[PDB]
Design a protein around this ligand. Structure first.
Ligand code: HEC
Length: 79
């Protein structure tokens, strides 16, 4: 699959232009940067980055294999 496909679900917590209030006050995804987003999204998928509220997101992003991980960051980096 590829990032774009996953994001469609992600809208639930991040909104379109990755800025809605997630599980409380959270940094907006809104073009942090592909580097940042990749490392953080990778962090979550791998389980290196996370926390209580992140648990849902962790499993959500966990579905992303590799193409997906990279592309999700790339996509989010222009959103
Ligand atoms: C709520 C139910 C969420 C779902 C589903 C998804 N994310 Fe999320 N995300 C959430 C929180 C609480 C935060 C914390 C950010 C902070 O530090 O305050 C985030 C943030 C991100 C980021 C930005 C990185 C950062 O700022 O630390 C990334 C890269 C991210 N989220 C990725 C991601 C993906 C790929 C999701 C859907 C495919 C997704 N999130 C859903 C809460 C929730």
């Amino acid at each position: 699959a590829d990032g774009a496909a996953l994001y469609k679900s992600c809208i639930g917590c991040h909104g379109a232009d990755g800025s809605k209030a997630a599980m409380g006050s959270a940094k907006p995804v809104k073009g942090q940067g592909a580097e940042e987003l990749y490392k953080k999204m990778k962090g979550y998928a791998d389980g290196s980055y996370g926390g209580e509220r992140k648990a849902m997101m962790t499993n959500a992003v966990k579905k992303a294999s590799d193409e997906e991980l990279k592309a999700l960051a790339d996509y989010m980096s222009k959103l």
